[PDB]
Structure formats: structure tokens, C-alpha cells
UniProtKB/Swiss-Prot annotation, chains A, B:
Coiled coil: none annotated. It comes from Bovine enterovirus (strain VG-5-27) (BEV). This is Capsid protein VP1. It is found in: Virion; Host cytoplasm. Interacts with capsid protein VP0, and capsid protein VP3 to form heterotrimeric protomers. Five protomers subsequently associate to form pentamers which serve as building blocks for the capsid. Interacts with capsid protein VP2, capsid protein VP3 and capsid protein VP4 following cleavage of capsid protein VP0. Residues 1-12, 1-19 are annotated as: Amphipathic alpha-helix. Forms an icosahedral capsid of pseudo T=3 symmetry with capsid proteins VP2 and VP3. The capsid is 300 Angstroms in diameter, composed of 60 copies of each capsid protein and enclosing the viral positive strand RNA genome. Capsid protein VP1 mainly forms the vertices of the capsid. Capsid protein VP1 interacts with host cell receptor to provide virion attachment to target host cells. This attachment induces virion internalization. Tyrosine kinases are probably involved in the entry process. After binding to its receptor, the capsid undergoes conformational changes.
From Swiss-Prot, chains E, F:
This is Capsid protein VP3. The chain holds residues 318 to 559 of 2175 of the full protein. It comes from the Viruses. Interacts with capsid protein VP0 and capsid protein VP1 to form heterotrimeric protomers. Five protomers subsequently associate to form pentamers which serve as building blocks for the capsid. Interacts with capsid protein VP4 in the mature capsid. Interacts with protein 2C; this interaction may be important for virion morphogenesis. The lineage of its organism: Viruses, Riboviria, Orthornavirae, Pisuviricota, Pisoniviricetes. It comes from Bovine enterovirus (strain VG-5-27) (BEV). Transmembrane segments: none annotated.
Amino acid sequence: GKMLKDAIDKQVAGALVAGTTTSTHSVATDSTPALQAAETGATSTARDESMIETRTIVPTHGIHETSVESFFGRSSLVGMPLLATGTSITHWRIDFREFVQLRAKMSWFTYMRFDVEFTIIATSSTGQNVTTEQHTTYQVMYVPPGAPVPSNQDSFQWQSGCNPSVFADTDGPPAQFSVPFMSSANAYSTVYDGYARFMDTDPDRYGILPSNFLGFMYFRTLEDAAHQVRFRIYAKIKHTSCWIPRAPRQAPYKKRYNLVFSGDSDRICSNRASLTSY
Amino acid sequence: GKMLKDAIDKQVAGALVAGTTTSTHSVATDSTPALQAAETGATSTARDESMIETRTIVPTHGIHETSVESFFGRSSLVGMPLLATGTSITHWRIDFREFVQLRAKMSWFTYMRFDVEFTIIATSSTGQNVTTEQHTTYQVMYVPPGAPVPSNQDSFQWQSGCNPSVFADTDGPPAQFSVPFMSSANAYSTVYDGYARFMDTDPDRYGILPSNFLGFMYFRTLEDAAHQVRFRIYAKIKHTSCWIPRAPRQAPYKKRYNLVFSGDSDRICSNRASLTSY
Amino acid sequence: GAQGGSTINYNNINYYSHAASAAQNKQDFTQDPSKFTQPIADVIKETAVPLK
Amino acid sequence: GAQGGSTINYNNINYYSHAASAAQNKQDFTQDPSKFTQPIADVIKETAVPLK
Amino acid sequence: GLPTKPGPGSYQFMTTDEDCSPCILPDFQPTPEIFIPGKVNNLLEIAQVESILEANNREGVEGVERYVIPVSVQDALDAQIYALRLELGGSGPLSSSLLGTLAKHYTQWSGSVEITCMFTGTFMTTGKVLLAYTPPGGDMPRNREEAMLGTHVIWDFGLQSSITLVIPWISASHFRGVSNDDVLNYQYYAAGHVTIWYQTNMVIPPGFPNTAGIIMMIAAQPNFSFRIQKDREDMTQTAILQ
Amino acid sequence: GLPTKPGPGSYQFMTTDEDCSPCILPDFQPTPEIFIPGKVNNLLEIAQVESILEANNREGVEGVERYVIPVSVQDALDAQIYALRLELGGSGPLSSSLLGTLAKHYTQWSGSVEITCMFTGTFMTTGKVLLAYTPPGGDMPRNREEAMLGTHVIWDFGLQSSITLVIPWISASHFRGVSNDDVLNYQYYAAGHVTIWYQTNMVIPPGFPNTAGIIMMIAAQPNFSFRIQKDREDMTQTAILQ
Amino acid sequence: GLPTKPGPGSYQFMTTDEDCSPCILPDFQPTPEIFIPGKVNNLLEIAQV
Amino acid sequence: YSDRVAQLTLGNSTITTQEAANICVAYGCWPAKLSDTDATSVDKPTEPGVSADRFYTLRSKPWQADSKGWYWKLPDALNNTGMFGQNAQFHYIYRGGWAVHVQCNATKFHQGTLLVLAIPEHQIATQEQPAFDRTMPGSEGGTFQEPFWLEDGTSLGNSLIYPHQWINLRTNNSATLILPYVNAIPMDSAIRHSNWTLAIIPVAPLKYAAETTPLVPITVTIAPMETEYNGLRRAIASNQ
Amino acid sequence: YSDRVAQLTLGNSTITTQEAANICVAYGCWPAKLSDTDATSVDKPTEPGVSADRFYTLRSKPWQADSKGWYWKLPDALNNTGMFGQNAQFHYIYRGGWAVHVQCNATKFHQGTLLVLAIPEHQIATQEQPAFDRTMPGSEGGTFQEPFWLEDGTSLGNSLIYPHQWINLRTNNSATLILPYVNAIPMDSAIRHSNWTLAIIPVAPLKYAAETTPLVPITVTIAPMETEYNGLRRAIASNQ
Ligand SMILES: CCCCCCCCCCCCCC(=O)O
Ligand SMILES: CCCCCCCCCCCCCC(=O)O
Ligand SMILES: CCCCCCCCCCCCCC(=O)O
Ligand SMILES: CCCCCCCCCCCCCC(=O)O
């Protein structure tokens, strides 16, 4: 049926890399492809065929593993809240900045528009952190800014009449759910050269764009936990638009909410004793 | 096939918000859009374009998250009966008034016609309420008004020849089932300015419309429970018709079966010291 | 719907017999705000004076 | 696609209502490298001298 | 049997699931739908209805009187009548209105808002009032000279009892955050100021009441919307209701 | 119910799964996409942009100066300016460039690379330089006589400040390994050598700076690609960021 | 295998379920239906007596 | 041309006002008779016509300095009045709409504002569940004690969602509301259930150009509209 | 025929250079006005035209032997200058592109190379989160302390991904960049957010054919392009 045709999108990865045309020797004063001028800011236009004698090469290699979708389109850890047994409650602030691998991958772009698939793995363990048996339901509640936060395991906030929740078992399959692009802005921002507030220039609000922050995930067990639970929160970025590539992060990350780095030794690649030998 | 076409309904959320037409300055005695009269009971008709000079704005925002279906169309807690080990039996009276979030959401309307998806999460725990292991079947029996109630775990009422029952495991996936609009009336009523009975004006039967009450859910374990079981009963309202919007509840709820409130301090929003500063 | 902008387009497929089993309806239905905003016998056009 | 060479050919089938539920997009989209490599008002053909 | 691979998310219960589920009473045939007046299909039909601002929120004012802003005969020129931070969230006067109480259920908002004011003085009582909307970036306007630089209407008391100041959607972004969540710096979404000033003065015949009132009313324009349902802050319970 | 047989891989979570999954907010309607300049659809658009080699990686050179290879007036003929092992992996100068940092995320590479050199001496400073690419099998070329036997360009300093040596894809196989993993003998994928020599000499007018610089720049050609994502070696953490 | 997501209500037994289920005697061929007087299709035929 | 001048003629009765605002027609729905598709009761209804579809005037109320407001249940307030009252007493079930007219004149030397609410299904409470003398107060009506909370734990400010007009003394001396039948069933008992509440709440207090405060009454006039009755038996006056 | 000679005329102002390289147009995108499909703010924008779309010259900088570099935030650097500055002060939100022209002449007896970066959303840090005097330095601009790390934990070598030119003294004395508006929203506040940073970093140091080092200034000239402003109120100068 055509109605089911609406739920199917045929999508194709068949873009190839550029090929090579055979070329011959050139002795002239007409064509000088090797002479360049980096001052313009343009990258060199010279190609293989104009610099040496080439054979013909039919293109066969795909480019799809470096499409922005493929590069971001896998799951990565973004949150690891620990539910202790004293209160049986925990939360994770929602952003991709606690764990460095996804953050550094995002640092190649300025603005990014995407959806998210979240995946939550819960693991129970003892005080000495050895795996242990515990079968219990847990509740993950999305708490958006301005909604009252639960303060206990039995708080009546966990009613969840308006906050969305997911209920799953600690020893069941992983909870998984998708999320549309939720920013009030038309993209997310990986970096922000401004202040979070008018009438304020506190350093702690520099580089803080609050339209990236959609709130909190809160976690309880539905009864009081017998053992601590660790939730691992994975995000896969999908349906991805990217704008304005950047110099990628090179210094290690130090803080969650700013770009501070050490910068004690100004170098990235390793040293050698002489430029004319390895 | 066309027969399977009967089981598919293509349904679309593409209603947009109103746009903006550009306007220019107006110097006249003809058109006075800013002059109003609130005495009529009509809301102001003045629009942006007639009050200031506007640009053109193409509408892009949807309205679907405030459709009545979307606003009610999620699950909320409505019942939390506890099955103790002494009798291994409990029940929940069926109405959406024990827990305040769903009740307050319903208080925006007078009459509401809907279906229900119920979801039941069972959790076992110790006397000190710490999660514990217990694998057992439980039985939820719909007991409508006039059907004899079970008095024990082994009562022969649990035969369930005519009452519908659901059997599920305490440590299995949650039981879930749907329900059509069951009122003898043509809608449910969120508020009732009348008496439950003729020839009676007892205050305890004021505001009681018994056509909202479809009876009881009764709960046993199929054997005698070793640990207490807590059932959490969630309802999602769906296929929703709503009539006659109301002033929504503002004072906290106090009782399950009437609108009594404290009303000690007559205000809702917070105070300030002066109307001409914040 | 593999996407238009703010158009969610859904094929609700009910697997059970009773219509009550079906998932929630995603249609946008007609809005008549004026039964609540302009609930008056005589229409008052925006550019007119309301009284008289 | 039971295989052409470097052509992955996929029918993304979304079972849920919201487009955000769909799996990741496998299309190759247009590449315009020259907005970054040749970001200059006057085109400089390869065989010409760049300055002047 | 058809070979399958159940994946992640198996057996979870999400409260916003949109799935069909077996009916426990598959033979039931409900009562017909009858005509009832006032069917609502979308809560933005309610948000476009005017409601009264709890505008006189001064410490010590209780009850119905919180709905009338005082307006008096002034002995000095260009005085201020009222000041209000434009906010759908928080706990100020807009928060308890129809639009404000709907905004309590939502995280984000967009669109134009209108404020309709009704004067309640005697027939013989005259006056002119300046109603100003100041876009964000600074503080509340300090004097009528500064406030007039913004969007503003000038109200003449007369036969038509009421005025509208349309607060237009003026915004860097398509949407703002409803809340003012501090830890999350949602003051980023500061939406400006509404102030009311005496444009001339309130003038009365000898021995008339030297004080009258404005009843402020607010509603959403047709270009308004809400996103992201969220729990209402002030609808709580400490126990199951009995 | 339809008879089924769930098979192996049931309930597993693979990080590269391509599956639809229920949306926790199925009624949400996002903000429109606006025009933004510089949309990127494929990271090989970035790899074709020239970036500066951290080429002066001698022990003791810090900061911006690591970006300028010294070039001097020579007192002897046919001297060597620079030597560089052609490697997208490891930790040598190519590893910190745009192409090198992208290669840190990938396991395999193919295609031609180009190196653009810009001379920074005074207008009056002259010179001719030989830039050589030696295919693998042996060591770095020891003298300009040996290096010239390979692919090479000869650069005349003049008005056009810059030159390109195209390092063409010359390879037994369609792809090479990015890394030089020793236990796995990925030195199998040795990709050759780049060396720079004085073709004549740097010559200056009396009392000019006798030392100038080359800024080396590198980028991928349009026939280039990467395979197999892999973790970046030098982007680590010992603790969760707070 | 076809990727699936079993949801809530998995493995429950509802007494009013309307589902097909495997027949323990799939080759059985019942006796024909004969005519009997007084066939009842709906209990409201009894209620009208 | 003038929505400040109105005339309302029902039966043998006619109202006029020279200072109206307009006429509020609740939910844009004029009262209408019950169609065969929504009806359930099989007996042929009695439709009394002009004998009941006419304006009835209740006793007037003084607007005092301290007044919190007044309220009337419908049909409750008219259940003992005229042929409407008799038809409502003699039948088990009733249906119909209302034409409500609130009168209050004062001077150009007065100020003050009344809010005139028609509230459907206005179930009331306070710190306690209310007794019968407040839920069904009869022709004399009741008084608010929590006008800020609209006697129901909601707020007066948000009650503009209900059909309403104002009486602002500088502008008008009368409010008119036309109310359709509202219920979740087709017909319902007149003695057991109140479909509408007429509520008149002072918002801006009543002030005079002197300190001597003459008598300013409020007067309610209500006409039933498009009435039907089913279930004829003896006459029953109240649910007690 | 000659991309070494350029003339730039905006408003009442005209720049010339006899040693340009070319003109960099960032992302191949000429500045453009906001279309009705992407716009959200409903008020009619003010477009000041030539009163603001003109070249402004900042104070010059000496290129010294030790110089690490200089930077300016935009619109920050021009927020107190001319009718651009006034339109940016008096409106809540602003949008527009830039025409940037960096001048530095020296002799055929000099050597040295400047890198001229236009960096969008250039959020900066060092071992510490920066203060306001560095995030929004004004017309005088700021200076780099970590030019190798591009003040942001990235690398200067990879910043050629950003729109750029060089000033290599043997080749050219000037760099020209045309910048489109870049943001994740349609308009944004001029005092709270800097959309672009103009960064001028010495890569090859400045050397003279003698040991006596005369003064070689760097001079920045910036023209706003295709500007709009919405949200008129009083004038607000800074985010402090
Ligand atoms: C739990 C359902 C709603 C949660 C919304 C999650 C959306 C996350 C998007 C994060 C984008 C900003 C990333 C960042 O600031 O580093
Ligand atoms: C268990 C199967 C039959 C149960 C029927 C449940 C229907 C519940 C509808 C409740 C509507 C009235 C809500 C209320 O009174 O507050
Ligand atoms: C077992 C029979 C398979 C039929 C289900 C096909 C997929 C469901 C249709 C979903 C339609 C809306 C999806 C969308 O376009 O957003
Ligand atoms: C339950 C409905 C069954 C429909 C699923 C049919 C198989 C999925 C289509 C996969 C299309 C791409 C596969 C390929 O050719 O590589």
C-alpha cells in the first residue's frame, strides 16, 4: 500500500571517490599548475594528472564512512549516575560533556542539528563493586526545566502525570528511546562566545548557552534498593545536520562547562632531535 | 488488501500557528483597533499588525502538543494498592482521584469522553520495604458493581467465569490492557453539582456522580505471598473528547471525593513589596 | 515520516478487534476559538468601536 | 543489497509515528568542498598563475 | 515460526508510548456521542481567552482585591502605575492566569501576548495612561521618558472602557523557555518588561472617589504555542487522597 | 499470535545498530531548519582543506615557531632542508594536522595527498628548492642525487609564493593502514618519504636576514578516503568531567 | 531474524483475549451440524420471553 | 447600530435596557430542543411553551460595601415559580436553556464593577463539604464566602473562561446571557442536579461621590428557553 | 586581470590596496538579509543603510618582535562606534555580515607573515575561564596568550579550516574577508554574544634588513554589511 510506502524511505550510499585520467608530459610556458599562492586562503588546485604522468583509474571507493551521519551515527557513553542504597535516587544532567570521546567528535563543528537514541544499561553491584543479583524495576523520569525535582524515592513527583517516564527492569533488556531535535534554537551549539544572561558577565556564565540544556533525567528504583545500581547512559546521534567546521580539540578536556586547558608545553606532535632525519 | 486497510487509519498533525502579515503606519480616525470593551465578555480582537508596524512571518510552529489528545495522551499513576502477606488480597477503587497530577489535568474540562490504557507494575519488597526476589503469578479481577467481592485469597470468586481477569507474573513484563468509554452517560463528568440519590441531601452524597464509578479491581497472588507486593496502576487517557473548559484547580486537593480546600490565605501568586518595582 | 517540517504523518495500525485498543489519535482537529473568545450575538470587527 | 560494489541500498522502515524514531539516514548527500577550499571571489583555474 | 530478534527496549514501559493494546472488554458498545456545547479540541483555544491578572500582588492584599491595580489622583507628573516582568513561568502575577497556568504544564513558549486593561472609575473620572513593553537587555524602565522608547500604547479613559497593549513576539529565537531555572541559567530567556504610567493624570470632579482601579487581563494571540509537557510545580501531595 | 522464533543476538545492544526505536515525545514539532552558511555533509570536505604542518618538531621548539621550517643561506652545495616519513598515523608532524586528526579517527586510508609550501623570506630573497617523494622499500634518501630519482618538484622562489608537491597514491594495495601498530606489523603499510633539498641556495642582498621560513601545508586530494572508525588515541580522561 | 520489540503486556493471560492459538488436534474433523429446533443466537431472545 | 439598547421578549414578558454591552451567547450555542438521535426517554415530552418560557424576576439584593457576591442554582432557583416550577415538579426529568438578565443601575457619581458568571456544573466546597441550604439555596440564592477561590478551589481570575459579562457602572447597567442546556446526558432531574450557576461577584467595590451610601439593588431576571419534560408523575418539590 | 588591486566602496567610504591577494568570501556566502521563512521576530526591522554599512577604522597596533597576536570580537568591537554602534545599542537584537580589511605594509627589506583569521563562535579559554575584559575587549581588542592553542585548546595549525588570508610581506600588504552572518538562531543580541572573532596572529616573525626596527603598524578596517535590528527600546551599551 501507498500508506505503508509513507513509512519506508529508500536511501542510497553510492557516492564514489574521484577517479584518475591518464596524462602525458607537458613542456610549455602556457600551463603552470604547480605555482600556487597560499596567501589568498584558497587550497591548492593542482591535481595528480597535472604534476606527473598518470594512468587512468576508475573510481571504486565509497565515501560513506565519513559522511556526518556515519561519523556520529553510533552510540557513546554520556552519563554514568550511581544509585546508592541510602536514598535509592540519583539523576544525570543531560548534555554530552562528561565523557570526552563524543565531546571531541562534536568539536569538529559549530552548530549541529540532530535526533538522539538513548540507551540505558543498569548494573547492580555490591559495596565492593562486585556484580550481584538484584531484580527490580527502575524509573527514569525526564524532568524539564521548571518541573519540581523528586527529593526521595517515594516522592509523589514520580507520579509522572506530565513528565515522560520509562520503566524497565535492572536485569532485563536495556531501555531505549528516541528524541527529536529539542532546542529552542534552530541548531545546537558546540561552542558559545557569549554570556548566559543579560546584565551579568560572571566568568561562570561565559560560554554557557542555556538553549543546549533540556533538563534532567531522574532515577529511582521502585522499591528501596538492596544494592547500588549503576546506570550507563548511551547516546547515538542521528538524522544529523552539521555546519561550520572547526579546528578540533587538541588539548585534553578539563572541565564540563568550559574549554579550559593546561597549555604548559605548546606542542601536539612528538619531538625529534633533527629535522633532516627521523 | 482493503480489509487490512480497515485496520489502518492515516492521521495527520499538520495544523500550524497563525502567521504575520507586514503592516505600515496608520494615521486616521477611521480604524481604532486598540479601543476595546471587556464588559461584553468578548476577548480583545486587536492583533499585532494593527497595533505596531509588523514584518511578514511565515507560520512554522505546530500546535499538536496542546491538542487535547496529546495533553492527556500519556500514562500517569492512579492507584497504588499494597498486597500484604497476611491475607494476600487487596483492591483499588477505580477512579482518577487518589493522585493529584492527573486529577488536576482533568480539572480543565467539565465533560470528558475517552478510552483508557491501564498499565500495572508489580513490585515485591520486604517488611522494611527493600526490594526482594519473589516470582509469583498475580490475578487482577475487574469486579463491577453488584458482583460479589472476593474475601480471601482462595475465595471461589476468583474463578472469574464472568468477571474479566488478567494474570501476569510479579517479575515479568507489566500487564497492560485497554478499556472503551464505559459510562452509562454520554461523557464522564469531572465535577457534579448535584446529589447521588433522590430523597437524600446528605453532604457526603453531594458532588458524587455514580455514573463515573465502574467498580473495583481486586488483586491476589495465586499462592500466598511470601513478601508484600505493591501494584502501581497507570492510566493513559486516549481517543479523547473534551467539552466546557473550566478554571483549573488552584488550591491543593485535600479529599478524594470532594473539592474541599483550605483557603486560609486568599492568593495564588507570590507577593512583592511594591507594585512599581520587582 | 522520514522528515515539510512540523507535519507528523502516522499510520495507526490497530492489531485488535475493538477500536478502543487503537493507539492515540494524531489528527489535528478543527479549532473554533471564537465560541469562547467572541461569544456574543453581534460580531464586533476589530477596526470598529465595540460599544454602540 | 545482496551484493555494483560500494553501493549500500537500504529501505529504512520506521515502525513508530515520529520521524525522530527512524533509524539513521544512509543517503550520501551533496559535497560542495569548494565553499571551504576555494572561498574566494575570483576563481583561479588550476593552469593559471594565482596572483595577478 | 518467523525468525525474530527482539532488541533493546524490549518489555519496557514508556509513559508516552503510542501502541495498540488488547481490550479487556472487546464486545462492549459504548453510548453514542451526543451534542454538547463548547467542545475543545486544543488547549490553545483556552489560552486565547482573556483571564484576569492577579496583578495587585502587594504584600498584605488578600482575595478579590488582588485583581484591581490602584489608580489615583496624582500630585506629581509622569508617575508610575505598575511594573511587571514579562514571564510565563515563576510565581509572579502572570503565573496564576489561564495562560500562566497552561504554561505551568509546558517548558517552552512562542508568540504574541495581549494585555487588555479595563478602567473602573466613575463615568466622570478622566485620565490618560501609557502602557509600555520594553524588550530585554536591561532593567525595568525607570521613568516614563525611558519607557516610551519601547513598544507602547496610550490609553484615553472614555466610553470604550478598555484598551489592548499587544506584546508582540520579539525574540532572538523561535522559542523561549517558560521557566527561570537558575542552575540552568534560563534567565537567558528574559522576555522584557511591561510598565504602566500616567500619561496625564487621573482627574475627578469635587468630592468623587480619588482612587479607582484597572483590571488587567491577559491572553495569547493566534500565533502562540507551547512545547514540552512538564509537571506543574504547585500541584503536589504528601499522601494518597482518601 | 503469529508463531515466532527469536534467535541469537536477542536483547543485545550493539552501538552501531541501525534500528527504529519508540520516541519518548511523539507529538513534538521541532523548530524549522534555517539557512546557515557552511553546511558540511561529509568529513572529506574538511580533509581537502589545507592546514599547517607542525613541521618544525625539533626538541626545544615551542609554540607557533613549530610551524616554520628554517631555511638559511648555505655555505655548501645540495644540502638538506627537511625530512619526513609519510604517515597518517603515529605522532609525527602529519598527525596533528586536519588530515592527520581525521586519520586518528580511522583505521585505513587511500588516495593522493598534496603538500603546499609557502616561502616567507624577504621580497629580495631568492632560492630554488627540490621537494621529493620516495616510494617505500628503503630508507630516507641520503643525498639530493638519490632523492631526485623519485617523484619530485623543483620550486623557484618568486611572485607566486607557494608550490605544491602532489604525493600521488602509489601503492601495492587499494588501501593502507593508518596506524603503525608494532605487534600487528602495520609497518607493512610503510608509505614512503618526503624530503626537501636546496636545489641551488638561498641568496640574499648584503645585510638581509640570512634565515627565512617555509610554512608547510597539507591536505587530501579528491581521490582520498578513510575506513573503519576507531578511537582517538590522545583524547583521554581519568575522571568524569565536573 | 526480523527485529522486534516485545512491549508491556507480554506473556500475560487476559480472560477476554481474542487471539488465535495452536490446536492440539489439528487433523480432527468434527461431526456435522444437524438441524435442532430452537437455536439461540442472542440471550435477548430469552429476555423477551 | 446600537448594542447598548436591547429588548428581550419571551412569552407575555419583555425586558428593555438602554445600557447593555452586548448579549453573551454561551459557547455560541442558542438553546435548542433535543433531537431524536440523542434522545433516550421513549415517552412523548410535554413542551409547555409560553406558560413557562418567560422572564421571572427574583427578589432584589442590596449591593453593600462588604458584599462578597451572590449565586443561584438553575433550575433550582425557579423550581417553585410559575408554570416552569410546576412542570419541573411534576416531571422526573427536564431539559432547557436560559435567558439571564442582571440589572444594576447606579449613577454617573458611582463606581464599581460586578462580574456576572454563568458557571456550568458549579460544584462548590470550602474548608467543608456544603449543606443543602448552600448547594440548592432556592429563589433567594446563596452568598459566596470564598469569592477569590470561586467557592471551588479554583480562582475567580480564571473564571473568565466561563460565559460572562461585566457590569462596570461607568459603562452599563445590565448583563444578558443566553445559556444552552449543558449536561453529560440528554435530560436530567431538576431537583437533584443544577446544570448552571448564576454568580454575581463584586470585583471593584461600590463607591459613591459622598459618604452617605444610598441603596443600590441588584436584580436577577431569568427566562427558561426551549424546555421539555418527560416522566410525568405526582409533583415532587425538592430532593429532600 | 589583477586580483592584486582592489577597491571596496561601502557608504561614504572607500578602501584601496595595490597588493591584495584576492578576496575571501567565507563559505562562499555573501551577506544577505533575513527571509520571511526563517524570521521569528514579528516587528518590522530597522535597516539603517549607509549610515551604518560603511568602513570603520580601529586604532592601529604596532607589530613588535615578541607579538603573539591580536583579536577583536564582532559586533563587540564596533558596538560604541558610529551609527552602527547606536543602532546596536538601541535594539534588543541585531543581525548582519562584515567586510574586514587588515592593512600592514612594510618594505621589500622586511620579512614576516601574519595569519588573518575570521573565527565564528570563537569561545576562548586558557588555564582559567576568562574575564569580561578578555571575552569582550571592545574597540581596542585583546591579545593572545596561547596563540599556539588558538586561545581555545585547539591548534593554530588547524585553524585554516576557518575563513582566512595571509599577509606575507614579500607578497601582499592587505587581507580582505567578507563574512556572512553565522548563528544558530535568526537574530541575536549584539552586547551578549559575539558571532565572529577577527584574529591576526604572527607566524613568521617580523625581520628587518637592519637591527634598528622601525614602526610597522597593523590596522583593522571593518564594515558592517546587510544589517537589521529589531526590538527597539532605550540604548544599552554593554552586558554589564
Ligand atoms: C529525556 C528526554 C528529553 C531529553 C532531551 C535530550 C536532548 C539532548 C541534546 C543535547 C544537545 C546539547 C549537547 C551539549 O550541550 O553538549
Ligand atoms: C478494569 C476494566 C473496567 C474498568 C473501567 C475503568 C474506567 C475508568 C474511567 C474513569 C472515569 C471517571 C474518572 C473519575 O471519576 O475521576
Ligand atoms: C507487521 C506489519 C508491518 C506494518 C507496519 C509498518 C510500519 C508502521 C507504519 C508507521 C507509519 C508512520 C511512520 C512514519 O512515517 O513516521
Ligand atoms: C514486518 C514487515 C517486513 C518488512 C521488512 C523487509 C526487510 C527490510 C528491508 C531491508 C532493505 C535493505 C536490505 C538490503 O537490501 O540490504
